[PDB]
Design a protein around this ligand. Structure first.
Ligand code: HEC
Lengths: 431, 55
């Protein structure tokens, strides 16, 4: 329940939990796919893949350490998990790979075998993971010609034309000290870790700052990846959401909980206290849907994603869903808000407190990099419970009502009507 | 004519008929739209419109 963080030469952030059997240690850099270019796009993902290379991974396996990495938009992270006792040997492997082997991982035999793996990896994604593929393209069109548009896994064309020098160039511009935070989760104490860190000196590229860019911006638009050979239609639609560290950060997430997620095959899901379900179940407008409030450093996306085999009624799916969202500005009820608060706490809890320290590190790391600290789970609940119907209405009237949208879809989307028809539904006629 | 030449009977029946026909035309227009609906409009290229329609 304690979020301890101190700075000496490097910023150290930890969160202890004695009941945890293992401990995870790692470095989280304040730069991700949002820092790349259209041409070196996929370099971060490539780094992650060599860090988990058979060679580097075997060295950690002998020592009894497990490797894990995650490439996001605003950040990047390299994590090593171990037993509570080997909390020192994780730091040896961390330093040995980011300073000593910052040239042994980049061999012309390791790099090629890895490049061939991320190529089959990113290709498999585009060929089969339609829901995530669609969600990735949603960011692509919504934030076109802006940092948030670049996909995390990179594109096949920028990937196959990438070389060892590109990795180095990126590493020497972002893997800096002022653009880093060392994180530790599990059971180890803050004072326990900071000592092993403040022990080993050496700055290594100190005072150096990463390159700057241009601010991210939402552009109402769409990308339609029609493919009549797929057995379904997958669509994602959203408005400009909230950036992390926004006053309405929670109002937005609550609003998404009101409509929540659905799965037509799960008996219990068909019974949720969601008004939209009365409309969509009559003719079974979809197999599933899920709302989200994605937040990043400069912006975010608020909307929903859905999958359906009812290809001749896609317009009803979109129409009923948008009519429900209209409600947030004009008629959302106290009980809908209250139901959302309870369910938001339950999901926010299950995230911030899972039985896995690697998840804790990513959540902690990502937060401290943006606001310099982490809001305690109990602090969130105070903010969540304080939200009134009046708040949700003021938010919706600014973010949802008669606002541009961004759309992306693949599969049998002939039935997804034109942009203007969808856009017109972002409001209602009144006297 | 209703007689020996164009006279009163003629003009009175022509007004009655002038009032009637517009309604028969209206019924024919509906039949015209019905035939139009089953195949839809054509376009300036003279080819199929099935690959790209807008409401
Ligand atoms: C002798 C020919 C002809 C006459 C007279 C005619 N139509 Fe048409 N109409 C057509 C044809 C053929 C089309 C299909 C055009 C196409 O899609 O290429 C058509 C299409 C239409 C359309 C669709 C839009 C358009 O302009 O293509 C409407 C509406 C329509 N007609 C209304 C009428 C009405 C109302 C009348 C008369 C009161 C009328 N038509 C008289 C031949 C005719």
């Amino acid at each position: 329940a304690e979020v301890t963080q101190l700075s000496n030469g490097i910023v150290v952030a930890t969160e202890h939990n004695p009941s945890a059997h293992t401990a995870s240690v790692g470095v989280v850099f304040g730069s991700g796919a949002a820092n790349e270019n259209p041409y070196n796009n996929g370099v971060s993902n490539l780094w992650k893949n060599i860090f988990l290379s058979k060679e580097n991974s075997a060295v950690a396996a002998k020592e009894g350490l497990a490797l894990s990495s995650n490439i996001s938009r605003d950040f990047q992270s390299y994590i090593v998990s171990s037993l509570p006792g080997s909390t020192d040997k994780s730091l040896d492997f961390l330093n040995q790979s980011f300073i000593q082997q910052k040239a042994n991982l980049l061999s012309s035999s390791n790099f090629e075998a890895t490049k061939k793996s991320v190529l089959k990896q990113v290709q498999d994604f585009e060929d089969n993971d339609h829901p995530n593929r669609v969600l990735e393209h949603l960011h692509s069109t919504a934030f076109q010609n802006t940092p948030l548009s670049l996909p995390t896994r990179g594109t096949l064309e920028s990937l196959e034309n990438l070389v060892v020098a590109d990795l180095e160039s990126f590493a020497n511009n972002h893997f800096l000290n002022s653009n880093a935070v060392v994180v530790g989760t599990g059971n180890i104490k803050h004072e326990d870790l900071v000592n092993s860190i403040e022990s080993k000196n050496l700055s290594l590229q100190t005072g150096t700052k990463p390159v700057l860019k241009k601010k991210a911006a939402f552009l109402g638009s769409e990308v339609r990846l029609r493919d009549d050979t797929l057995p379904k239609a997958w669509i994602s639609l959203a408005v400009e959401g909230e950036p992390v560290n926004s006053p309405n950060y929670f109002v937005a997430k609550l609003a998404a909980q009101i409509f929540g997620s659905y799965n037509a095959f799960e008996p219990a899901s068909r019974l949720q206290g969601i008004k939209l379900l009365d409309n969509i179940q009559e003719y079974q407008l979809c197999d599933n849907f899920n709302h989200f409030s994605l937040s990043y450093k400069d912006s975010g996306l608020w909307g929903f994603s859905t999958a359906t085999r009812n290809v001749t009624m896609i317009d009803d799916l979109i129409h009923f869903t948008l009519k429900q969202w209209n409600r947030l500005t004009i008629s959302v009820t106290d009980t809908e808000v209250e139901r959302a608060k309870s369910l938001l706490k339950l999901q926010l809890g299950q995230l911030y407190e899972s039985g896995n320290p690697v998840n804790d590190a990513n959540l902690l790391g990502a937060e401290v990099l943006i606001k310099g600290s982490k809001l305690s789970l109990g602090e969130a609940f105070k903010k969540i419970d304080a939200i009134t119907v009046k708040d949700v209405k003021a938010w919706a009237g600014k973010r949802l009502w008669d606002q541009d949208i961004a759309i992306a879809g693949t599969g049998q989307i002939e039935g997804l009507l034109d942009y203007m028809r969808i856009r017109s539904d972002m409001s209602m006629m009144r006297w | 004519w209703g007689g020996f030449s164009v006279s009163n009977p003629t003009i009175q029946r022509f007004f009655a008929l002038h009032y009637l026909v517009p309604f028969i035309i209206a019924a024919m227009v509906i039949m015209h739209l019905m035939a139009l609906h089953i195949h839809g409009s054509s376009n300036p290229l003279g080819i199929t419109g099935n690959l790209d329609r807008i409401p």
